[PDB]
Design a protein around this ligand. Structure first.
Ligand SMILES: CC(C)=CCC/C(C)=C/COP(=O)(O)OP(=O)(O)O
Ligand SMILES: CC(C)=CCC/C(C)=C\COP(=O)(O)OP(=O)(O)O
Ligand SMILES: [Mg+2]
Ligand SMILES: [Mg+2]
Lengths: 284, 284
């Protein structure tokens, strides 16, 4: 509707935070078919009945509040980032249940190089490890995942683990996740402009025929549709250069809770809020 | 502090909406030097005291709610637009009293062509008329005003009035107002890329030396600073393609009030909220 019908009471749940990393549970097959039904949330709550025409096609999430969450508990920054991993997969599962087809996640920004070298080194190694550790699960779920971001300075290991994940999941179609690492909206537009410039220098493009579509086709990932719902947690009301081209007409929802406390029910609440919003795209 | 002191109690007030267009009051002579103090608000409220370093340098406003405002009163949508003129000038006045250096106003977007022919026709002539009617006053307040927008489809008469306003006020420095008509963020970025492409074709630019700053330098108005505070009235929570490149890192404040009900005290309220907040890591 296009939601998955409620899960059988006994269907496996997620996340069990009794251990870290959180062990993603074994799922029954349910053939003949392809993708496994994502695990139900711990609370066993069901996705709300949102009609196709009022559901966001593409949700972009700026995950925020990890450091504050850690500090509330006298913990190292790193421990809040670690708690955020389960939340990503939880939101993936909820996204699928609700029927969201595109999901962009701001895993690491071009501005995040301004953090301490210790934290940046953790975040790089952490993203590398998360993709390696979760990509098999994501594939089973019918998730198509791939890297979106800028090449310079990004660890080759992180690009390489995502390329592997991209190849493994290239024919999946339940949901697409743009895993944005070393991503910058201005930077992505700039890279598109560089490509365009090269074609002009090569005599292959008339400057006068450059249109908005020219820019869109030359973005790293030209198939990414416009952002309908732009979410950011921790109550910070800033887009921070995320999905800059794509989100020009996005609806913003700013939720107060810190990312490690976030779960799929909060995503669902944001989508209900989106459902009530009226979008005009400049029309009367 | 960069605020103007509270105005003399007997200093002219603005706006009186008992006439349309509203009458801009005669102001006492400057002995001199140049720029005259703006009329104070009808309420005689004074701008809040905010250190120059904690103000937003650049405030962008999406003026919204004119149509709903008219509809509440059983009036044609264009009657709401008419009321917006006074609010623009009142906010200009209030921005000067607060010490704001940069103000961008979204007067008509590249997507507003989707509206009815009668509303578009009105908005074009209305913007033309407002600039002609208010140009001399803005000049005497020390406002530097100029057009920001895309040329195709925009009435030449609107461009022409703003050209005269730009020339008359090019040496002013109290506040800069970007008067954005037929403005579209994606379209402005595209125009810059076309500019870059032309330079590349002429050999005056190396495509491998193109950076984010190359794009910035090729925007229509390259001197526009980053938007610090992005405001939108009417309860809508979206940027709608306004100051797209420039507002990458903006803080958003959404105010529920309809534009014709807005006044300079509301601008002050948002700026004080912006200013008083602790500027956390990852915010300039
Ligand atoms: C002062 C000036 C130049 C105003 C023009 C602003 C323009 C974009 C219309 C905003 O109201 P609206 O028409 O979008 O109102 P509503 O959303 O209620 O229909
Ligand atoms: C892989 C993971 C978990 C990514 C999370 C996103 C990351 C860039 C930091 C988000 O929180 P924060 O560090 O900015 O929190 P705070 O603002 O509270 O310090
Ligand atoms: Mg943060
Ligand atoms: Mg509107």
């Amino acid at each position: 509707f296009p939601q998955l019908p409620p899960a059988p009471d006994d269907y496996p749940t997620f996340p069990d935070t009794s251990t870290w990393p959180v062990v993603f549970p074994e799922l029954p097959a349910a053939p003949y078919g392809g993708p496994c039904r994502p695990p139900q949330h711990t609370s066993k709550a069901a996705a709300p009945r949102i009609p196709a025409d009022r559901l966001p096609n593409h949700v972009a999430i700026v995950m925020d509040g990890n450091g504050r969450w850690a500090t509330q508990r006298g913990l190292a920054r790193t421990e809040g980032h670690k708690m955020g991993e389960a939340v990503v997969i939880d939101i993936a599962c909820g996204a699928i249940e609700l029927g969201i087809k595109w999901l962009s996640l701001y895993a690491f920004s071009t501005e995040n190089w301004k953090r301490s070298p210790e934290e940046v080194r953790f975040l790089m190694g952490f993203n590398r490890d998360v993709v390696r550790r979760r990509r098999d699960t994501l594939k089973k779920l019918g998730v198509r995942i791939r890297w979106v971001g800028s090449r310079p300075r990004l660890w080759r290991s992180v690009i390489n683990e995502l390329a592997v994940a991209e190849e493994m999941t290239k024919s999946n179609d339940v949901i697409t996740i743009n895993y944005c690492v070393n991503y910058g909206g201005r930077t992505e537009i700039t890279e598109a402009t560089r490509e365009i410039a090269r074609e002009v220098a090569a005599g292959r493009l008339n400057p006068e025929r450059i249109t908005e579509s020219t820019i869109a086709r030359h973005l790293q990932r030209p198939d990414i549709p416009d952002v309908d719902l732009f979410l950011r947690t921790s109550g910070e009301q800033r887009s921070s250069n995320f999905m800059l081209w794509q989100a020009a007409y996005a609806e913003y929802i700013f939720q107060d809770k810190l990312w490690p406390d976030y779960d799929r029910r909060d995503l669902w609440a944001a989508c209900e809020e989106y459902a009530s919003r009226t979008r005009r795209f400049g029309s009367a």
